[PDB]
RNA sequence: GCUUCGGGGAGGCGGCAAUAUCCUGUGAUCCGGAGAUUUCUGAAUGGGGAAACCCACUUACCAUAAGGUAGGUAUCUUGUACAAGAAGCGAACGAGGGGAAGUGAAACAUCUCAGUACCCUUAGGAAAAGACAUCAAAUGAGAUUCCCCAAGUAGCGGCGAGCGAACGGGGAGAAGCCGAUUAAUGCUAAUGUAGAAGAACAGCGUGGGAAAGCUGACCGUAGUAGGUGAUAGUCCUGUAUUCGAAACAUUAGCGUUAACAUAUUAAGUAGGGCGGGACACGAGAAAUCCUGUCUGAAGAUGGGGGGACCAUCCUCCAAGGCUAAAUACUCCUGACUGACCGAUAGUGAACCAGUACCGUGAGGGAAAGGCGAAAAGAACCCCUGUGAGGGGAG
RNA sequence: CCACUGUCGUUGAAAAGCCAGGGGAUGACUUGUGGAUAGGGGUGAAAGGCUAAUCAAACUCGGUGACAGCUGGUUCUCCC
RNA sequence: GUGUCGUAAGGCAUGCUGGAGGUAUCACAAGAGCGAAUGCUGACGUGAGUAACGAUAAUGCGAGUGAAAAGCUCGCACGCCGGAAGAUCAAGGGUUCCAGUCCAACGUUAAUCGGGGCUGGGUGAGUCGACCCCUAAGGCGAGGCCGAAAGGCGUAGUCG
RNA sequence: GAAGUGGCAAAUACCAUGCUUCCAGGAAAAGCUUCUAAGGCUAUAAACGAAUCGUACCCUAAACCGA
């Protein structure tokens, strides 16, 4: 369905690896939904950025860091990010 | 809850007893009245926001039972009661006189 | 707000809900990239989507 | 020298885990006792 | 288990009592046996695990009257 | 957090914990009733599994690609390959199936502990029992249950240690029936789950601050409440008193519906032998009850009991089923109380506690409350490393 | 993989080790992973060994505040 | 603290501190009196500024930074391992990985350094591994067998 | 902006799940190849796919087991 592809992409990644990949190979780095597949990432990117064609999706899960605060021991959310290669 | 924002009250208890003012803020049991119960704040300066800093003089919350609504006619401290107008309106009235206004 | 939503057809409630989900994605991208000053549109848009889904459930149930 | 613990996750979860407890009447009584005491850790 | 179908005879608990009156927990078991009973009205043998008290009950009441009670009571 | 129905009336977006963007008389926050949504695991139920995961099959539909939406798919029981149930969890109390030892006997085996702890099965708001095959022996009573007596009596007992009635009396509650069953539905009444109003104090001195002091008032169906800058009936929240329900729950009464049940007087029964158990009662002169084993009647011209047993007399009819109350209890809800504790106390736990920590695990298991009335939580300057810490200032 | 001798260490670097030597080193060998045997039970080329630094009867909880003719302790004052 | 009073347990008065409660008298009830129990909990002494600072592979110096440098960075030299004290994993751990920043505590000293604090970043697969298909030991096990109950066993299977 | 090919030596790795011997006589099941039972397949390509989870880092250790 089309109401699932809107929630697949959670936000772009802004870091030096992201910027280097975008400059050199023109790949987009996204934070994606933790339950999203590579096929849904392909469809979401091509749907929401009209005029672009996805070549390859590489995905990974990254664990959240244990960051204490006051007397507590919490931890950040896990999250999944995708590297999306585009037809230039 | 009987004193709202905007009505004029008289301070009946504390260092500022006998002074009048307009109610700025009402919390559960504490009230803030402009011009009365003024503290000195040593505000630490900061560049992240637009406030300069310095020594400031701002009004502090005091207990709501230390203030009384000021009668607009007799110019004296008075209590507040409620009236059930047959037209279908619940208005605060003064306890002593009993007129609708405030 | 709900006043001008209760008298909308099921079809146009669906069509407006889809636009609201698209707007939610746009808000998410703008907030992640820093182009969202008033940071309450996300809350209001999410509440509107919840309202739309409530009304769609009601109109599909009765 | 070699010490007593010598950890192994498969062995731990197969001898003490949630399914091993739930698979016996006495393990379920273990779990009920832990829940009545209010332990935040039910099983290994 | 070791329970008579028609009489409900099951192991009973009690004491071994010695001459010095020492008491040890014991059981009394039913005299259960496996017996094939001829049922004329079904033209068939039915094999029951039954006590001898139940066998006397079959003698006095008939296999049909006991089989119908077994079926009513359950396990059949 | 969404909708809605009510309440309410100026603030609000839960706490540490503020800030930002904002919302709110077009009625927000908030409170109460109903509804919608309700990921995954877990009885977990489509199969599996190292819980929060892996892998499916199928029906309808959609898409054209590698999928999506809405379902179905565990097992067992009862009914005609189909419908209805059940499952698991969870305080104590009930009923039932099994059942110790430490201890006491100044040792110890009978005995005690004790039918206790514990294990196991399974209910209900209670359960069980219950209407005489019961007692009594008086001038007879009249089901069951519970309480006070009878009474530490009569007895039982290596007649040791110990165990320990009954009759009958005074009470609580009373009921007797042959469906005194369960589950819905609709009216009627009541209650509950938010709320509303609610009297009456001024002056003077002290004081940082007045509620305390002095003087004089007032309300009271409201005067020993909690707060408020010190001790307030008249400052606030309250209290006495009088009151509200759109919605849903519960209780009772009447009516209807559908599920089950509806005996007809009772034979493998009563009694007996053997071995045990229960009876206060340990085989004892041992009645009575239960039954593992082996037997086995009479059947109202009959049979059971009245503590070996017989006769006489009295009483009652087993081998069909049910039955409220008085009784037991507290995971809990409301109200109220305490010659109960007050931070080594009281819960282990006043605080981010069944936590930290210890243990493979079952399991064990802490410490830790208080600025001030209000943060007014010390702008700024100085020493110092832009640190700690301090001295001024405030 | 073992553990024969000695020194050291013995509030250790270590709740059994280090160093110098020593034994077996294709076998009745050593070792990884998973599994089985559970308390009067197991397992034992047998020392009552071992069964989570616990073993002539594990550990945890319960009976349980076991019992203790034994040891310790037992808190203000004065008068006879 | 002081004074004062009583045979005593103790009473009373009062200076200072303290900042919000206390309690005459007579009755009444007790969690009613502590130096000992190798008592329990917390705090703090003595030992004592004593032992020790954990492999005897080893360091010297010049610069830099810094409040401060034996220990950090860079350089030169020296030394040690090199069937490891180098490298790749599994198990186990779980962010310890990298950068910036800080030095209170932690690090047996100092620290500008760090596996420490804080804030960011980082793990990309049709071919590697898992998952998946298959089964071993061994589990569970429609029905079935056995057993007071709980349960024990076991076939087809289903896991492993 | 350079070279990049000859000799010799040589594993415990490979040929080799081989070979030779011995007795203590040496997993299973599937994938795979065939055969049929009840009742699509083989070549040729062309286009398009191959999901999910792990992957940092230590690992004779300062990161695991030994407080």
């Amino acid at each position: 369905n089309n109401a699932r592809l809107y929630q697949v992409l959670r936000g772009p990644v802004f870091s030096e690896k992201s910027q280097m990949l975008g400059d050199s190979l023109g790949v987009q780095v996204f934070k994606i939904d933790s339950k999203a597949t590579k096929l849904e990432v392909k469809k979401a990117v091509e749907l929401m950025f009209e005029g672009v064609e996805v070549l390859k999706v590489n995905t990974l899960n990254v664990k959240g860091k244990t960051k204490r605060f006051g007397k507590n021991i919490g931890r950040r959310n896990d999250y999944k990010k995708a590297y999306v290669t585009l037809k230039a | 809850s009987k004193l709202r924002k905007g009505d004029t009250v008289i301070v009946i208890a504390g260092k500022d007893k006998g002074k009048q003012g307009t109610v700025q803020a009402v919390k559960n049991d504490r009230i803030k009245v402009e011009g009365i119960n003024i503290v000195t704040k040593h505000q630490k300066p900061n560049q992240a926001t637009g406030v300069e800093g310095g020594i400031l003089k701002q009004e502090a919350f005091l207990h709501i039972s230390n203030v009384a609504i000021l009668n607009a006619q007799t110019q004296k401290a008075d209590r507040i009661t409620y009236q059930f107008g047959e037209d279908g309106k619940k208005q605060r009235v003064y306890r002593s006189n009993g007129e609708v206004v405030a | 707000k709900i006043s001008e939503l209760r008298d909308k057809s099921l079809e146009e409630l669906t069509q407006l809900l889809d636009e609201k989900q698209l707007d939610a994605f746009r808000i998410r991208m703008a907030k992640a990239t820093g182009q969202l000053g008033n940071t309450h549109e996300v809350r209001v848009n999410r509440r509107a989507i919840a309202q739309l889904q409530t009304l769609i459930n009601e109109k599909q149930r009765g | 020298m070699k010490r007593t613990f010598q950890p192994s996750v498969i062995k731990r979860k197969r001898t003490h885990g949630f399914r091993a407890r739930m698979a016996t009447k006495k393990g379920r009584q273990v779990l009920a006792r832990r829940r009545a005491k209010g332990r935040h850790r039910l099983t290994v | 288990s070791r329970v008579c179908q028609v009489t409900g005879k099951r192991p009973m608990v009690g004491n071994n009592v010695s001459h010095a009156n020492n008491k040890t927990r014991r059981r009394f078991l039913p005299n259960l046996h496996h017996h094939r009973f001829w049922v004329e009205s079904e033209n068939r043998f039915v094999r029951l695990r039954i006590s001898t008290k139940g066998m006397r009950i079959i003698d006095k009441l008939g296999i049909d009257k006991v089989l119908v009670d077994l079926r009513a009571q359950g396990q059949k």
Side-chain angles (χ1 to χ4, degrees), chain B residues 1-5 12-15 17 26 28 30 39-45 53-55 58 60-61 63-67 76 79 81-82 90 95:
Chain B
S1 57
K2 291 218 187 160
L3 305 162
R4 305 209 344 160
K5 207 201 325 213
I12 70 186
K15 54 180 199 168
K17 191 222 277 163
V26 182
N28 330 121
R30 295 200 90 67
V39 297
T40 89
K41 176 77 186 190
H42 298 94
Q43 204 45 261
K44 188 79 192 190
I55 272 157
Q58 60 207 39
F61 278 96
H63 203 263
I64 205 191
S65 61
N66 289 350
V67 301
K76 220 164 73 99
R79 306 170 231 120
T81 176
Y82 287 104
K90 189 168 149 182
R95 187 79 61 73

Side-chain angles (χ1 to χ4, degrees), chain B residues 33-63:
Chain B
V33 189
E34 67 149 17
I36 72 108
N37 193 63
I38 280 188
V39 297
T40 89
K41 176 77 186 190
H42 298 94
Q43 204 45 261
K44 188 79 192 190
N46 281 314
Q47 79 280 61
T49 76
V51 295
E52 168 49 42
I55 272 157
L56 326 174
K57 278 187 165 293
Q58 60 207 39
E59 301 118 8
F61 278 96
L62 73 164
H63 203 263

Side-chain angles (χ1 to χ4, degrees), chain E residues 9-27:
Chain E
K9 303 289 215 44
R10 68 180 52 250
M12 216 195 48
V13 294
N15 277 315
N16 282 320
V17 192
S18 71
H19 159 97
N21 229 292
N22 310 108
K23 307 212 168 148
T24 50
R25 302 308 297 158
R26 75 161 281 181
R27 299 215 305 164

Side-chain angles (χ1 to χ4, degrees), chain C:
Chain C
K1 157 138 67 54
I2 192 70
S3 64
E4 66 260 15
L5 278 158
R6 198 156 277 289
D7 45 40
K8 267 188 191 71
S9 159
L10 181 50
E11 291 302 323
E12 67 189 348
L13 280 178
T14 292
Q15 197 275 301
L16 180 49
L17 169 69
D18 219 353
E19 274 161 52
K20 289 280 161 232
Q21 321 249 61
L22 181 296
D23 207 357
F25 161 89
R26 190 222 84 229
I27 278 279
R28 203 181 323 120
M29 284 312 118
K31 169 158 82 103
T33 188
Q35 309 284 346
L36 182 51
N38 41 345
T39 182
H40 69 274
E41 296 173 357
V42 36
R43 204 208 186 101
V44 79
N45 190 271
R46 173 213 312 142
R47 298 281 155 101
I49 290 166
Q51 271 165 1
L52 282 149
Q53 283 187 246
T54 316
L55 292 189
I56 288 166
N57 268 250
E58 278 163 14
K59 270 156 182 55
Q60 270 185 333
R61 182 179 63 243

